[PDB]
Amino acid sequence: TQEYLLKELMKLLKEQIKLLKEQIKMLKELEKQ
Amino acid sequence: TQEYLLKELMKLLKEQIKLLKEQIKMLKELEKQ
Amino acid sequence: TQEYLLKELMKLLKEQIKLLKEQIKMLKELEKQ
Amino acid sequence: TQEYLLKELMKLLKEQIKLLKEQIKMLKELEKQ
Amino acid sequence: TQEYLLKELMKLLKEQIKLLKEQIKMLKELEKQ
């Protein structure tokens, strides 16, 4: 059961990475202004 | 109490994801002007 | 305004710091087990 | 070891807090402009 | 100045992503145990 929960935590951290990359793309749009 | 502690980390990581999505909404508004 | 949206981003980052501190406390308890 | 991995995770979260504090500082500098 | 600050925010988010990748490495070894 502990191993199953550790796999869930890794999935949630990967989602944080995806959203941070979306923020970087938005910061580049702002940099053109 | 390891399963309890891992479930509490799951909830905190989900809350982090929610905050990142709220930040993206604000960056989009900033880009519009 | 620009000022309004930057201040809201600051509040959301401060909330992320609060949650990271709670995550550290959960890891500290796991380490003892 | 389990102890090594949990102690290193705690150190990485503390480094994340330091980055968030610097992100807040950059937003405050943007606000002044 | 505004462009310099936006580029610094991009660098800080890239540093966050690197820390999150390192956290995933540690959770991966804990899951194998």
Author numbering:
A (entry chain E), B (entry chain A), C (entry chain B), D (entry chain C), E (entry chain D): 1 to 33
Q: How did the manuscript describe this experimental structure?
A:
CCs are quaternary structures comprising two or more α-helices supercoiled around each other with cyclic (Cn) or dihedral (Dn) symmetry. Here, we describe variants with all combinations of the aliphatic residues, Ile, Leu and Val, at a and d to give four classes of peptide: the ββ class, with a and d = Ile or Val; Lβ, a = Leu and d = Ile or Val; βL, a = Ile or Val and d = Leu; and LL, a = d = Leu. Peptides are named systematically appending the one-letter code for the amino acids at the a and d sites to “CC-Type2-“; e.g., CC-Hept becomes CC-Type2-LI. In summary, solution-phase data and X-ray crystal structures demonstrate conclusively that different classes of Type-2 coiled-coil (CC) peptides—i.e., based on abcdefg repeats with predominantly hydrophobic residues at a, d, e and g—adopt a range of distinct states.
Finally, we tested the importance of β-branched residues at d in maintaining open-barrels outside of our designs. A recent design of a parallel pentameric α-helical barrel 5H2L_2.125 has a single Ile residue at d. We mutated this to Leu to give 5H2L_2.1-I9L. The peptide formed a stable 4-helix assembly in solution but crystallised as a mixed parallel/antiparallel CC pentamer, which is another low-symmetry structure. Thus, the single β-branched residues at d appears critical for specifying the open, all-parallel, α-helical barrel of 5H2L_2.125. In addition to a/d combinations, residues larger than Ala at the e and g sites influence the state adopted as they strongly specify against high-order blunt-ended barrels and fully collapsed states. This is demonstrated with the 5H2L_2.1-I9L mutant that lacks β-branched residues at the a and d positions. The sequence crystallises as an antiparallel pentameric barrel instead of forming a collapsed structure.
